[PDB]
C-alpha cells in the first residue's frame, strides 16, 4: 500500500520483536504499551506472548462517568448542589478526555463571570458548551428549513 | 470517511442508515408544533412567530386542513411540507371517493407512512425532510407522529421542532388523559412558550383543533385565543425565572 | 331474476332466486347467487349469473383487506361505493349485474342498490330490484313495520319472490332466503323455503 | 476500507454481501419479538414497550393481522414494516382471489422474502432492514422468520431483534416439543421479559395467536392477559436473581 | 354439447359427448375431450371444443405448477377458481366454454362448475350445465342416490348423454367417461363405452 | 459538507440540503428585485440594468406577466427562470381552462412551489437556482417569495438578490402600513436606489403593478416612470450622504 | 489498492470479472451439496445439519422439485436460490406447455445459464451469488453444474459449497462408471461425511433422486435413509482415522 | 492510465478503450480453438478437454452448429458463450424466415458483431467476454474471427484463446494457401497440439466441419478422428523434441 | 497455549490457592481464546 513505507516500518517492528523475546531476554520488561486501533497490527505482535494479557480499555460506562467527575472536582472548588448522575447521562458515549475537558470548561466559566468559584450552575453550563462542539443539532431556522 | 450517507442505499456496519436519521435532524432544526390529545378532542398548535415584520406575521400556514375532520401540522422543510400536505389532501379524499366515510386518523397515517417509504427506499429520489402530526377525530381522538423515515408512533402528546425536548419533559410532569379541553389547551400554551423561550402573543401562534362533539376542524380566531394565552404568560414567567 | 331486501330492527333479510332458468338451461340446482362478503354482510344479485359471481369474489377479498388495513369491520356504506367504482372502472369488462349490499355494521342497518352501470343509491327500508320489482313492492309493504322482526321478515320476503316466479315461465322453483340477525348467517335453501310458500299453496 | 461496501451490487473479497450483512444488525437495534410453536397452535409475542412515558401504551401495534389466520410480528424499523406488510397483506388475499383457499404458512413467507430479494438484487434501492416472524396455521402450526437477505428458515421457537441473543440460550434448556398451549404462551412472556431483562406489565406488550382448532386470528386483551404475565414474572424474577 | 357430473360415495365420475360433427368433419376421430389435469383431477367441457383443447394445456401445466411449487397437492376448489380468472381474460375471442372440474382433495369429493366468464360453485350431488341439462337431470335422479358405487356410476352417466343425443343436433355412440376413485384414473373411451350402451337398446 | 454537498441526494449531519443552500447563493448572485405591498395594490420594481452599454435595455427584464392580474420577478439563473416562469403562465392558464376563474395569488405560488419541489425531490434533476417574488391581487394584494427549495413565505415588504440585506434593513426603519399607493411607490424606488448606490434613470429599471381598483397587471411606460424616479432621487441622494 | 471489483461492468486487467470470482467465493460460504450420477439414476444430497435445534428438521431442504423428473439443489444464498428455482420451474413448465414434451435436462441447464447471465450482463443488477446442480432423467441421467456466472458444465459427480474440495478428490479416486444405485447411495453418503468431517444420521441430510427405471422423481424419506446411512459410516470412520 | 477502465464510456489519453482491451484478455482465459480454411471446405477444432477427469468431455461443447452450414467455436467464458450462440442461432434462422436464402457467413458474422457493438456502447451493459470463430460455406469457404470489441476479420487460419501466440508462430511458417481436405485436417490438429503442449486423443478434441461440396455441417466421431490424430501426434512429438 | 497456562495460574492467585486445578484451566481457555479471535460470525442467517 506504499512500497517504500511498509518495509521501513516493518524492519523496525521485527527488530523490536527480536529484543522482546525473539532471542534476547526480556530483561524483566513488563510492556505496557498502547494502541488506538487493534486491527492495524501485524500478526506477529498481535498475539499473546508478545503481550500476554490483551486488555480492552473501552470508553467508560455510565458509572465510569461518575467516577471520573468525582476525582476532577476535588481539583476544582466543587459544586454546591452536587449531582454527578445528571451529567453522566448526557455525557454517555464520550471519552475520559471529555470528562477532563468539561471540568476545565467549568472552571473557566467561573473566570469569565469573575465569580472565581465553580458551582453546579457553572458545571451544567460547561457540559452544554463542550458537548455543543460534538453534536451537530443547532442551527439554523429558515427561510426554508422552518 | 463514512459513505453511509453519501446516499440512502446503504447502511453502516452498525446497522443504521445514517442518512434517514439525518432527515430526522431536518425536523429538529425546524420549528415547533405541538399536538395535545385529550378525550374531548385533539388540539394542534404551531409556530407562526416565523420571520421578521417585513414578512406577513399572519403568514399562511402551519395549520393545514386535510379534510373537515382530520388535520395536520408540520416541522422540517415547508417546501417539503407544502407538497406532502398536498399528497396527504389527495390521499384522504381518495378514501372518501372509494368508500365514502370520513378517512380515519389511523388510515391517513399508514398511507402517508407508505408514501414516505417510497422515497426512502429508492436512491434516485431523496427522502422527505419533513415530519408530520396527524390529529383528528375519526370517532376516538387520536394523535400520531409520522417520521421522515416513515414510521408511526402513537402518543398521549407529542411535539416536534426545536423545542421538542423541553416540551417532552414538560408533559413528563403535568400531562394526564383525564384533563379537560380548557386545561389541555392552557398547558400546551405553557409548553409552546418554552419552545420559543419567550412569552406568547395571540398574533404569533396559529391554532386549530378537531373537537369530539363536533367531529370537525375549526381554527381558533385571534381574540378567542387571547384569554388562553393570557393566563399562560403568568406560569411562563415563573418558568423563565429558572 | 329478482331480489328483495328489507331492513329489520335487528337484522337485514334479503332473498334471491337460487335456480335460474332461461329456455331449458339450468346453471345448476345448487347454484349460488347469495354471496357472503363479510361476517354480517350479504349480497343478493339479479341479472346474469356468471358476471354476479366473478365480480362478487373480488369484493369478499376486498372486505377482508380493508378490514385488515383499518383494523376495523367494514361499513355497509364502504362496500356499496367500492363495488360501484370497480364496476365503472371495469366497463371494458362489463358486468351486467344489479347488486344489493346490506347487512349490519356499526352505523346500523341499510341496504343499497348498485346499478349494473355503477352508482350507489340508498334505500330507507324497502327495496326490490329486477324485473319482478313492480309486483314485489306492494306485496312487501303490506305487513311492513320497521319494527317487524326477523321471524316475520323471512316469511314476508318469500311472498314477493313467490308472486314473480309463479306468473313467470322463466322461474317456478328455487329460492334462497338469507337471514342475518347480528348472531347468525343462515341460508335457508330451496327445501326449507318450500314450506313457506306451501302455506300459500298453489 | 472496510469493503467494497457502498453498493448492494458489490461483493467483498470474502464473498459476502456487505450491504445485507450491515442491514441485519439494523434489525437487532429495533424492537424484540418472540415467536413460539406448539402443536396446539402458535403464539406470537411483540414488544409494545418503547420510548418515553409520553408515548401512549399502544405504539402501533406491533403484530399485524396479515390474513384471517396468519399474523406477523415485526422487528427492526417500523417504517420498513409498513411497506413490506402492505404488499404482504395484499398478497395473502391475492391467493384467496385465485385459489379461494387458505394461503400456506410456508408460501406466504416466501412471497414476503421475494419482496426483499428484489431489494437485494437491484442497485436502485436499499434492502429493507426489517424482519418479520410469520405465525399461522395452514392445518398445523408453522413459524418462520423472514430475514432481510430474503432468507427463509423454519423455526420452532425464536427471537429476533434485541432479545435474539438472550432468548437463544433460554430456549436450549427450556424449549420442548410436548409443551401445552398455556405453558408455551407463559414461556413466550418469560422470553420477552428476559429480552429487556426487566419485569413486565401486561398493558404495554401485545400478544396474538392462531390455534389449530380455531384457525382464526385472535388477540389477548390486557384484562385476560394478566395471569399468564404473573406466572411469567415468578420465573423472570428467578432468572434475574443471578 | 353437454356434460354431466356426479359425486359418488368414494369417487367422482363425469362424462362428455362425442362423435357429432364439428366444423364440417366428424368430431370424434380420436379426439381428446376429457383432459387430465392431475392424476386425480380432470376437466370436461361443454362449449367451444378447440378452445377447451388449448385451455386444457394451460390448466394441466398450472396444476403441475401448484403441485411442484407448494409441496401440497392441488385442491378441487383451487383449480376451478384459477379457471375463473383465465376465462375472464379471454372474454373477447371464441372461448365460451362451461366447464366442470372435479376430482378428490383433502376436503373430500367434489365437482365445481365454472360459468363462461368464471365463477365456481360447489355441487356435491349432480350438475349439468349444457343445453342437455334438463334431460340429464331427469335420467340422473331415477337411480342416483346419495350413496352410489363408482362402477354403478359409469352406467348412469353414459345413459343420460345418450338420451341427450336426441335433444341435441348431433352426437353418436361411444363417449368419454372417466372415473377417479383415489385408486385409479381410468378413462374408458368409445370401445368400452359402446358396450354399456348396448344394454340400453336403441 | 466536504463530500455531502456535491449532490442533492445528500443530507448532512446538520439536517439541511447543501445543494439547495448553494442554489440560493445562485439567487444572491443575481440582481436585486423588490416588491412592496400596500392595501391599495402591490408593486413590483425590477433592475433592468444592462451590464454593458452595448446591450438593449428593453429586454433583460425580470418583470414577467403570468396572467392578466399576476406578475412576478426573479433573481437567479436567467435560463432556469424563463422556463419556470413560462410554466407559471401555463399553470395560471390551466386554472382558467378547468374553473373559468383567474388563479388566486396564494394558489399560483403554491402550485409553482410544488413545481420546484419535484425537481428537488427527484435526485436525477438539480433544484432550480431561482427564487421568485410573485406580486398580484386576487381581491386583495398578496406577495409571496418562492425559495429554490419550494418553501413559501408570505411578505408585505421584501426583496431578493444581491441587495437583499440592505433593503431588509431599509424596510425595517422606513416602511409603514399607513402608506398609500403613491407613498410606497416612492419607497420602492428609494430601496432600489439604496442597493445600487447611485441615482437611477428609467433605462436600468422597470415597474409593473397590480392595483385593486384595476384588478389588472399594467406596465409603467418610460413616460410614466419619470415622476416616480424624480420624487425618489431627492431621498436617494440623502442616503448616500453618510 | 485496486478497484476492479466495485462494479460488475468492470473487467480487471487480468481478464476476469473479479465480481464473479467472488461470486464464486460466495457459493462456498454456504453449506455443501453433492450430486452423484450413476447409470441407473441420479442422486442429489444436501446438508440438513444446518441450523439449530430450535429450528425444525424440515428447515431448507434444498432439493427442490423443478419437475416430476428433475430435481435441483443449491448452495449460496437461499434467497437468490428460490428465485432461480422459481424461474427454473417456469422454464420447465413452458416446455410442456408449448410442446407437450417433458423438459430436456441439457436444455433446462441451458435456459438457466442464460438467465444467470442476464444478471451478469446488466450492470444495475448483481450476479447471483448461487450455484445450482441441475439434475434429471430425460431419458438418460445427467448431472450438470450451473455456476454464479451462469456457466454450463457436465459432471459425472461434483459438489458445490464448503465440502466441494474434499469430495472432488474422493470422487477422483473412488467414483466409477460401473456404479449402481445401491452402491451410489452408500458412496454419496461416504462423501457427504468427508464434507462435514463427521457421521450421518437420517435427519442431517435430505436426498432427492430421479431413477432411470422409474423416470420419476421420488424423494428419500428418513426411513429409507437409514440402511444407506449404516453401510456408509463404515468407511467414514476409517477415512477420518489417520 | 488507471481509472480510465472503470467505465466503457471512457477512452484513454493514448486513445483506445482499455476497458475493451481488458475484455479481450477475458477471451484469452479460454482454451485453445483453431480454425483452418481449406479449398474443399472449412474445418473447425476446439479443446474439448476440461478440468479434472470427473467432467465428461463429450457433453461439454466448444463447437456448436449455428446454422445447417455454419459452425462456431467459442473461447472465453461458457457463460457469455451461451447468450452469444443463442443470439447467433436465432439470427441465422430469422434470415431464412424473411429472405428464404441461408445467411452468408460474412453476414452472420457482421450481425453478431453489430449486436456486440451495441453492448460496449453504454455503461449499463458489459462487453461480451468471448470471441466466436464463425466457419461456414456460403459458396466459398470462409473463416472469421469475432472480437468482443465487435469487429469481424477474414482469415484463412486463425485462433482465439491462450493458444493464440503458438498458432501465430506455427502458421507463419507452415500455412500454405492451397491445401486439400486431408492435409488441412492434420495441420489444424498439429497447431492445437502445440498450444496445449500435449498429444491429442479423439476423446478430448471436438471437430466440426462444413465442406464446400455438401454445404452441411457434420460432427466427426471418435472412430473417424483416429488416422488424422495419428499423423498429427507423431508430428507434435517431433516438434517438441528435436 | 503458553498464555492459557500462565492465566490459569492467575485464577489460582485470585482464589488464594497455590495449586493449579482443572477449573482454572477451563476458565483460562475461555479468557484467552476469546480475547484473541471471535470464532463465529453467523453465516447461517445469510446463507443456507
Curated annotation (Swiss-Prot), chain A:
ATP binds at residue 72. Residues 144-146 are annotated as: Docks into pockets in the proteasome alpha-ring to cause gate opening. It comes from the Archaea. It is found in: Cytoplasm. Belongs to the AAA ATPase family. ATPase which is responsible for recognizing, binding, unfolding and translocation of substrate proteins into the archaeal 20S proteasome core particle. Is essential for opening the gate of the 20S proteasome via an interaction with its C-terminus, thereby allowing substrate entry and access to the site of proteolysis. Thus, the C-termini of the proteasomal ATPase function like a 'key in a lock' to induce gate opening and therefore regulate proteolysis. Consists of three main regions, an N-terminal coiled-coil domain that may assist in substrate recognition, an interdomain involved in PAN hexamerization, and a C-terminal ATPase domain of the AAA type. Homohexamer. The hexameric complex has a two-ring architecture resembling a top hat that caps the 20S proteasome core at one or both ends. Upon ATP-binding, the C-terminus of PAN interacts with the alpha-rings of the proteasome core by binding to the intersubunit pockets. This is Proteasome-activating nucleotidase. It comes from Archaeoglobus fulgidus (strain ATCC 49558 / DSM 4304 / JCM 9628 / NBRC 100126 / VC-16). The gene is pan.
UniProtKB/Swiss-Prot annotation, chains B, D, F, G, H:
One of its GO terms (cellular component) is proteasome core complex, alpha-subunit complex. The 20S proteasome core is composed of 14 alpha and 14 beta subunits that assemble into four stacked heptameric rings, resulting in a barrel-shaped structure. The two inner rings, each composed of seven catalytic beta subunits, are sandwiched by two outer rings, each composed of seven alpha subunits. The catalytic chamber with the active sites is on the inside of the barrel. Has probably a gated structure, the ends of the cylinder being occluded by the N-termini of the alpha-subunits. Is likely capped at one or both ends by the proteasome regulatory ATPase, PAN. One of its GO terms (molecular function) is threonine-type endopeptidase activity. It comes from Archaeoglobus fulgidus (strain ATCC 49558 / DSM 4304 / JCM 9628 / NBRC 100126 / VC-16). The gene is psmA. Coiled coil: none annotated. Transmembrane segments: none annotated. NCBIfam families: arc_protsome_A, PRK03996.1. Belongs to the peptidase T1A family. Component of the proteasome core, a large protease complex with broad specificity involved in protein degradation. It comes from the Archaea. HAMAP family: Proteasome_A_A. The keyword ATP-binding does not apply. Gene3D superfamilies: Glutamine Phosphoribosylpyrophosphate, subunit 1, domain 1. One of its GO terms (biological process) is proteasomal protein catabolic process. Its main location: cytoplasm. This is Proteasome subunit alpha.
Swiss-Prot record, chains C, E:
Its EC number is 3.4.25.1. One of its GO terms (cellular component) is cytoplasm. Component of the proteasome core, a large protease complex with broad specificity involved in protein degradation. The active site is at 1 (nucleophile). One of its GO terms (molecular function) is threonine-type endopeptidase activity. Its main location: cytoplasm. InterPro entries: Ntn_hydrolases_N, Pept_T1A_Psome_bsu_arc, Pept_T1A_subB, Proteasome_bsu_CS, Proteasome_sua/b, Proteasome_suB-type. It is found in: Cytoplasm. CDD domains: proteasome_beta_archeal (cd03764). Keywords: Autocatalytic cleavage, Cytoplasm, Hydrolase, Protease, Proteasome, Threonine protease, Zymogen. It comes from the Archaea. The keyword Protease applies. GO terms for biological process: proteasomal protein catabolic process. It catalyses: Cleavage of peptide bonds with very broad specificity. SUPFAM superfamilies: N-terminal nucleophile aminohydrolases (Ntn hydrolases). The formation of the proteasomal ATPase PAN-20S proteasome complex, via the docking of the C-termini of PAN into the intersubunit pockets in the alpha-rings, triggers opening of the gate for substrate entry. Interconversion between the open-gate and close-gate conformations leads to a dynamic regulation of the 20S proteasome proteolysis activity. This is Proteasome subunit beta. Belongs to the peptidase T1B family. The 20S proteasome core is composed of 14 alpha and 14 beta subunits that assemble into four stacked heptameric rings, resulting in a barrel-shaped structure. The two inner rings, each composed of seven catalytic beta subunits, are sandwiched by two outer rings, each composed of seven alpha subunits. The catalytic chamber with the active sites is on the inside of the barrel. Has probably a gated structure, the ends of the cylinder being occluded by the N-termini of the alpha-subunits. Is likely capped at one or both ends by the proteasome regulatory ATPase, PAN. PROSITE patterns: PROTEASOME_BETA_1 (PS00854), PROTEASOME_BETA_2 (PS51476).
